[PDB]
From Swiss-Prot, chain A:
GO terms for cellular component: cytoplasm; cytosol; cytosolic large ribosomal subunit. This is Large ribosomal subunit protein bL28. Disulfide bonds: none annotated. One of its GO terms (biological process) is ribosomal large subunit assembly. It comes from Escherichia coli (strain K12). NCBIfam families: L28. The keyword Ribosomal protein applies. SUPFAM superfamilies: L28p-like (SSF143800). Belongs to the bacterial ribosomal protein bL28 family. Part of the 50S ribosomal subunit. The gene is rpmB.
Swiss-Prot record, chain B:
The lineage of its organism: Bacteria, Pseudomonadati, Pseudomonadota, Gammaproteobacteria, Enterobacterales. HAMAP family: Ribosomal_uL29 (MF_00374). This is Large ribosomal subunit protein uL29. It comes from Escherichia coli (strain K12). GO terms for biological process: cytoplasmic translation; ribosomal large subunit assembly. CDD domains: Ribosomal_L29_HIP. The keyword Chloroplast does not apply. Belongs to the universal ribosomal protein uL29 family.
Curated annotation (Swiss-Prot), chain C:
GO terms for molecular function: large ribosomal subunit rRNA binding; structural constituent of ribosome. It comes from the Bacteria. It comes from Escherichia coli (strain K12). Pfam families: KOW (PF00467), ribosomal_L24 (PF17136). Part of the 50S ribosomal subunit. Might contact the SecYEG translocation complex when it is docked with the ribosome. The gene is rplX. This is Large ribosomal subunit protein uL24. Disulfide bonds: none annotated. One of its GO terms (cellular component) is cytosol. Keywords: Ribonucleoprotein, Ribosomal protein, RNA-binding, rRNA-binding. InterPro entries: KOW, Rib_uL2_dom2, Ribosomal_uL24, Ribosomal_uL24_CS, Ribosomal_uL24_KOW, Translation_prot_SH3-like_sf.
Swiss-Prot record, chain D:
InterPro entries: Nucleotide-bd_a/b_plait_sf, Ribosomal_uL23-like, Ribosomal_uL23/eL15/eS24_sf, Ribosomal_uL23_CS. This is Large ribosomal subunit protein uL23. Disulfide bonds: none annotated. Belongs to the universal ribosomal protein uL23 family. Keywords: Ribonucleoprotein, Ribosomal protein, RNA-binding, rRNA-binding. PROSITE patterns: RIBOSOMAL_L23. The keyword Ribonucleoprotein applies. The lineage of its organism: Bacteria, Pseudomonadati, Pseudomonadota, Gammaproteobacteria, Enterobacterales.
Length: 77, 62, 103, 94, 22, 46
RNA sequence: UACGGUGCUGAAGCAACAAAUGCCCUGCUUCCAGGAAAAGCCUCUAAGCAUCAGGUAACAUCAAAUCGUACCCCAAACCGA
RNA sequence: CGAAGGUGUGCUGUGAGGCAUGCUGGAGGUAUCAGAAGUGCGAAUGCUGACAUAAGUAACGAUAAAGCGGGUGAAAAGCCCGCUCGCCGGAAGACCAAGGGUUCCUGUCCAACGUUAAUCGGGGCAGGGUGAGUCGACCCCUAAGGCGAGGCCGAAAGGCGUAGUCGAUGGGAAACAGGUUAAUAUUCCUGUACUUGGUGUUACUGCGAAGGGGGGACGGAGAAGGCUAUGUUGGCCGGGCG
RNA sequence: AGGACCGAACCGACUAAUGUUGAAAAAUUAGCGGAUGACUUGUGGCUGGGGGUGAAAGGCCAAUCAAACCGGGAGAUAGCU
RNA sequence: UAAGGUGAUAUGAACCGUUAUAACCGGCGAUUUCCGAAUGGGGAAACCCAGUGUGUUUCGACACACUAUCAUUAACUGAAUCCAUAGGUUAAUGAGGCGAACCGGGGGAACUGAAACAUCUAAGUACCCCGAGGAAAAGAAAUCAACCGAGAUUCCCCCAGUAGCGGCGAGCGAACGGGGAGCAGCCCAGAGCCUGAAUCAGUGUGUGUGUUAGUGGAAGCGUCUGGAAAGGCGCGCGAUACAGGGUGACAGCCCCGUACACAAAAAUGCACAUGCUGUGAGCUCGAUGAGUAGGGCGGGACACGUGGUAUCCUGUCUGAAUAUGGGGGGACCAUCCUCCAAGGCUAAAUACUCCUGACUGACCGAUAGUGAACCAGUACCGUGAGGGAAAGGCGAAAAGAAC
């Protein structure tokens, strides 16, 4: 599923309007990419599927903080 | 009847029940014939099957 | 509970045979009683080849409701509704009018 | 070896017929009516230790019952396994 | 005994395009 | 003419039968409907 | 005899020719569009082995279920009311 | 001493309509003003249920085809028997397939069912009827696919898909000939054979496998060669001298 | 050797009469074409509706098809009857 | 509890008991083949086929028990690559599945309306999907007003179809404020100090408090009609009972029943107290929830549709402040007022009867009423989803009409 392993950024739905203001049923897709993350406190590479906001929250909130929180919330790496 | 059969063994009932089954099966084999002119013998023998077979579980493992 | 007992001697309030007593033969399903000598009616019968019957107009005794009969009183010469006391702890039937136990 | 408790339930009745009244004498065979969970073990050990007689070999089938109509509503009689039991040379039931 | 009361055949709209008036 | 229906139980009872309508999802949304009326002939097992 | 049946007896039982769309044939020839798998079986070995076990060479065995089996089947019995 | 409902009569208001009453009917109706309405049938090619209409008309489901004697009976054109006569015979014959669920067999029974009558029936009713180490299914093994933990992917359900485990119409053990009942029988019976599993002993002492290989193992056409199932004729045997 | 010929079973549906509340809601009769192949067929697995499949006819997808059928918003709505 | 039983159409055969172990009713149990989440593998549901540790064995074969699957906690084992690592093998509680309405989320339309129709409405309605409880949600102020204040959430009545939005058309629709029902506030982002301390959440127990069977319960007799009095016609009686139910037609006094009075060995709810099982109120204070607030970018929820748009939510790149700040007070600014966001907990009031009991009702009385008063979600019809019938009246008891 297109679900970010960090943010919880689930896809939502809007209506693509127009210059004549029409209405359809679009989707918005979160910005997922696979990635590998170095860890020294475990000394390995951890794989992850992560949003583009996640790949900048991971350089502020500490890598091992999220890597410990994901053991607790219920979504394994 | 069970207030009389309550004071018997663990293993004497495991000959009593087989004797009742032997005569019950005799009654079932005479139930082929148009001679067994007792109706309630079969049902009361089924009730004596019932009381004995429930005292069996009421003693053996209770 | 059914205050009209089995072997009691009851009398008939109304019907084709009012006034006359009887010694109750039995009672059927939902209270209907068969007075031995009152509810009398002819019945026809085809002769049957089972149990050796020759056929005839057998007069058997019919049924009647509880609300037609009542227990006859030996003392006052009429009927009486029946009530229940608890004498000695025993639930025992006893008469309403004249206040004295029957058995 | 089948225990006596299971053994004693396996029969209902012998079965009267014209083919029983031919297989009794002209081929010396008997016609049981057994319960539906009976195999050739549960009749080969069951003719023996219930009449204290012997047996040659056993055979069975599964008779499927007819369709009856009591009143105007349909009815289906219970099926019942019919067992043919051949008795050895020198045998005779009670 | 008794019996039923049948009805409602696929009556094929009772006609072809017979009356070719053109 | 060969009619609308030439029977074959060997496929009828696996393309309509009880375990077939229990294997999918919305077969459990037909077996969840036939009990509302309470069908005594529940499905096409004989 | 139950005049429907059945019980009890019983000779000859050979040859030749003809002959397949049935067998060998799952073969042969020959052509191109180039014509299943796996198991039962045949067989060889390591992880394992022990003078054991298992192995086929014998034979007395003991066993080998459960279910289908009636009936019609190009039809008066299936599908077409 | 006769309530609601039906029925006939007899009056009566300008009307929808009431009052009275003979008859059927065998337990409820209901003043008088008032209140609330699923409140009034000629339709609606309305909808159910009944009876008419054509009408005692068409038609009786092949142009293979019936006639007669005897019996059963209250009954015979069909039902049983018996003799002719027709007709199929690569079907309209026999056994089975996928299918159907007592239709098979006797004992009855005629109301309804058979485009008639009915003793008859695939009709009702009562009883009787299927037998296996070998035939088949189940089972050992796979094809096309299906399911499919994981895993990958998808708003969620789910979607394909790996190992697997499912999947006949095909691949793998076996056997036949005769007799029998009103019905089954390669299954029952005498007859004589065959296989496949664990056993105990007899001598023999390399078995070992989720692995290795040979096999199972395969298309279409024609062409012959020897052959039998069967068929014909003779020889024979039995009957007959038309 | 043959999408070779004549002609069976099998398919197929060209012509004509009959049959059209018929025997049959597409057939009988008598003639007809293919008939070792792009065949036909048994049984079984696969293809889902704005989709399938189609020697492609807008034909077929359970006797219904220029969007199958079964419930539902449905008391869609109808300025017309 | 008890003088009659063995369910019914449906009688009969053959039986059992009378001082309470006949039956009947209630509470707890033991039974509970097979299919079904099916859970040993599989499988056209009701069948087919096994593996393992263990008890008999007339060594033929039996009887019992267990084995899915993930999640979770592990114990142990465990390779590419040595210590370590994915994966593997066992245990144990949890969970799966079903079920009507009701609630909360994640997706999401159309004929119709505007007399056409796209923006709009129809509407977050039908319908699917997830998840949970008997209630759910929401929640204890970065909320409104207006210099005076109020004081969480929900729900009902108003304000009001107003002020607004809108091809300014169709139509939609507030809020501030006021009456109510009903009230309970807390806690972690944290150290210490009372340290085991108020409370709190299960345990069992006593008392009531019901629920699950039960028991008594008033009083009336004679005449005429007729099949029959329960009727009319006399004379009474009872009434903390004159509501209904049936009895050969209208019954307070015939009969079950009510008003009333009582009742439990066992189970069990709903409370106070209880010995506990486990968790902890009280003071000094510090410290105030960063990829967040707002904005660039579209968007959908606010009555609020591009509008002159505040507020909140977020897919996308951005992005600070930190008691001196920061948000809001319907662009925006200054003043003033008021409030501490980026974390949790939490009852009733409200919504709902598949199912349970009791009553009523200007509700139906067989073409009605639920599709069904009768054996109906059955027969019949469709491969299937699904649709869907018709069908009560003898009489007082069958007294069913022998010969
Ligand atoms: Mg829209
Ligand atoms: Mg009483
Ligand atoms: Mg009475
Ligand atoms: Mg299918
Ligand atoms: Mg046969
Ligand atoms: Mg035919
Ligand atoms: Mg037809
Ligand atoms: Mg009338
Ligand atoms: Mg009148
Ligand atoms: Mg009258
Ligand atoms: Mg009357
Ligand atoms: Mg009345
Ligand atoms: Mg009206
Ligand atoms: Mg009319
Ligand atoms: Mg009119
Ligand atoms: Mg009309
Ligand atoms: Mg009409
Ligand atoms: Mg007519
Ligand atoms: Mg006429
Ligand atoms: Mg005419
Ligand atoms: Mg004419
Ligand atoms: Mg004519
Ligand atoms: Mg004809
Ligand atoms: Mg004819
Ligand atoms: Mg004749
Ligand atoms: Mg004839
Ligand atoms: Mg003849
Ligand atoms: Mg001929
Ligand atoms: Mg034939
Ligand atoms: Mg039958
Ligand atoms: Mg027959
Ligand atoms: Mg006839
Ligand atoms: Mg006649
Ligand atoms: Mg016959
Ligand atoms: Mg018959
Ligand atoms: Mg058999
Ligand atoms: Mg045999
Ligand atoms: Mg596959
Ligand atoms: Mg799949
Ligand atoms: Mg999975
Ligand atoms: Mg397999
Ligand atoms: Mg096969
Ligand atoms: Mg095979
Ligand atoms: Mg075989
Ligand atoms: Mg036969
Ligand atoms: Mg090999
Ligand atoms: Mg070939
Ligand atoms: Mg030969
Ligand atoms: Mg020969
Ligand atoms: Mg001559
Ligand atoms: Mg064609
Ligand atoms: Mg043509
Ligand atoms: Mg032709
Ligand atoms: Mg040709
Ligand atoms: Mg040709
Ligand atoms: Mg065209
Ligand atoms: Mg079509
Ligand atoms: Mg469509
Ligand atoms: Mg459409
Ligand atoms: Mg709607
Ligand atoms: Mg409409
Ligand atoms: Mg009973
Ligand atoms: Mg299972
Ligand atoms: Mg298997
Ligand atoms: Mg399964
Ligand atoms: Mg629109
Ligand atoms: Mg439109
Ligand atoms: Mg419009
Ligand atoms: Mg809450
Ligand atoms: Mg203030
Ligand atoms: Mg009383
Ligand atoms: Mg935070
Ligand atoms: Mg803001
Ligand atoms: Mg933001
Ligand atoms: Mg903004
Ligand atoms: Mg914006
Ligand atoms: Mg904060
Ligand atoms: Mg908060
Ligand atoms: Mg009526
Ligand atoms: Mg109705
Ligand atoms: Mg059907």
């Amino acid at each position: 599923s297109r679900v970010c392993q960090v943010t919880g950024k689930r896809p939502v739905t809007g209506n693509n309007r127009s210059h004549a203001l029409n209405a359809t049923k679009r989707r918005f897709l979160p910005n997922l990419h696979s990635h590998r993350f170095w860890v020294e406190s475990e000394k390995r590479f951890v794989t992850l599927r992560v949003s583009a906001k996640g790949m900048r929250v991971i350089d502020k909130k500490g890598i091992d903080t999220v890597l410990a929180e994901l053991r607790a919330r219920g979504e394994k790496y | 009847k069970a207030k009389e059969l309550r004071e018997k063994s663990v293993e004497e009932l495991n000959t009593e029940l087989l004797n009742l089954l032997r005569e019950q099966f005799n009654l079932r084999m005479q139930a082929a014939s148009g001679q067994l002119q007792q109706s309630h013998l079969l049902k009361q023998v089924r009730r004596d099957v019932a009381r004995v077979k429930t005292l069996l579980n009421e003693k053996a493992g209770a | 509970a059914a205050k009209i007992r089995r072997d009691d001697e009851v009398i008939v309030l109304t019907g084709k045979d009012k006034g006359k007593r009887g010694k109750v033969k039995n009672v059927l399903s939902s209270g209907k009683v068969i007075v031995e000598g009152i509810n009398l009616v002819k019945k026809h019968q085809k002769p049957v080849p089972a149990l050796n019957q020759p056929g005839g107009i057998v007069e058997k005794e019919a049924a009647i409701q509880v609300s037609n009969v009542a227990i006859f009183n030996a003392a006052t010469g009429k009927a009486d509704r029946v009530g229940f006391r608890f004498e000695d702890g025993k639930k025992v039937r006893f008469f309403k009018s004249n206040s004295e136990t029957i058995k | 070896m089948i225990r006596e408790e299971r053994l004693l339930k396996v029969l209902r009745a012998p079965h009267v017929s014209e083919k029983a009244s031919t297989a009794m004498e002209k081929s010396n065979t008997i016609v049981l009516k057994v319960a539906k969970d009976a195999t050739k073990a549960e009749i080969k050990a069951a003719v023996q230790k219930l009449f204290e007689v012997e047996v040659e070999v056993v055979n069975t089938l599964v008779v499927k019952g007819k369709v009856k109509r009591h009143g105007q509503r349909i009815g289906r009689r219970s099926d019942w396994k019919k067992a043919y039991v051949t008795l050895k040379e020198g045998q005779n039931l009670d | 005994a008794a019996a039923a009361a049948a009805a409602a055949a696929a009556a094929a709209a009772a006609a072809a395009a017979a009356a070719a008036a053109a | 003419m060969k009619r609308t229906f030439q029977p074959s139980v060997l496929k009828r009872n696996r393309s309509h039968g009880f375990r077939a309508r229990m294997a999918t999802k919305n077969g459990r949304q037909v077996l969840a409907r036939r009990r509302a009326k309470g069908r005594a002939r529940l499905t096409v097992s004989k």
